[PDB]
Amino acid sequence: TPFPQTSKKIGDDATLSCNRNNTNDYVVMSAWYKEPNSIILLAAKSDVLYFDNYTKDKISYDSPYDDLVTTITIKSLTARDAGTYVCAFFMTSTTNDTDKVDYEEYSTELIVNT
């Protein structure tokens, strides 16, 4: 399956988490976007910048001090919260070895039904 299908009910809190494969490089940032061209948030360590019409109310960043994972929680799921959610890791080299930006990206389809 190219997309893990997370099925939840109306009103639940969906906790979406992702793990970085590269565990030996400096994570520049961790991004979350709704795949229909909507950027949810950009987390730089414990500083979260929310894009578009997104605030700390419905979606909360739950992994501010854990660098090996990224986790958000969508609260009070509605019918419009369904769709594909994408997590991404932007990382750089820690010792200038292979000077480049490494990028990881994973997707999951959230189905919020009655």
Next chain:
Amino acid sequence: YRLQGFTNAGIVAYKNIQDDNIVFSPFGYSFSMFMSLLPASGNTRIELLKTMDLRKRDLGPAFTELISGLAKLKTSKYTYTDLTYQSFVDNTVSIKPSYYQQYHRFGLYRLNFRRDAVNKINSIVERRSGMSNVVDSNMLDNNTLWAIINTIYFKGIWQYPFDITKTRNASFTNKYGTKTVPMMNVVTKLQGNTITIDDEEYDMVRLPYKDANISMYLAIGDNMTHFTDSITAAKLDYWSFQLGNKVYNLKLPKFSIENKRDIKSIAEMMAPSMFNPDNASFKHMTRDPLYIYKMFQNAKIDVDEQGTVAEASTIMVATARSSPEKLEFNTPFVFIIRHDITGFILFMGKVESPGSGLVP
């Protein structure tokens, strides 16, 4: 991995504006030059790292810091700052797949610049930032293939607003021999001081904004060129630390300024290869020869008794036609809108001060 070089880039960009009726966004220029680091490679990347005073080891954390700073600009409704960034690359350009996968969500748009690119780009920028008609018709031809737009909007409300009961005083310049302008007046306590900078007396005042750590600093002195040529981020922080509570009779003119300035000179002094198609190495985005030949910024500020409204748009494009403006102000003052936490300089400029000064 600090953003000292980031802010100093815009500071130097302002210091190279040979004029006195200036309204400029050092943060907009710095942000454009910093975002240019993602596609840049080789000599262009090295020049950009030099101007930002960063090494290859500090580029990752730097962005991190930047993001955190951006997270501290939309923290209220009384006073806020919205920033948008768009990139427009022609359909014929063969963008590398990794670059597109990484950065296409941060506004990477593809179009045919020969099919009414002006209206399409204006519509995209208006939908993403609310500002309409940002790009002009004479800044896009059938030859342009790359266009980067960086818009910033600052809504401010004075924490201690001016009383509407004010006077209309006559300022004396040489361009306008005597011009009557409304001058807001307020007698209150503020964080200011009167310091000496390289044996030159300068009076500094801070005007905070409601529900935010953003402040408008005002500096008044004899030779404002000396004050301009001696300011850095660290010196600005030190001067802020020298300010304290004291009584002030502030006479601030109710000014409204608009600038449309070509900043290609300073941007090329900082990154020459970025403005040269023979040396422009943006190999991270595409292997096709892409460069930038013109760079402008359109800024505007309006100050009244309630607060400040400022807009700025930095445009890197392939062609444009404009004429420089030169106004010689006598005894002016310098304003700086600064985020007191991140040190970011959102806006700054120079307004003609009345002969009585800002603090009688």
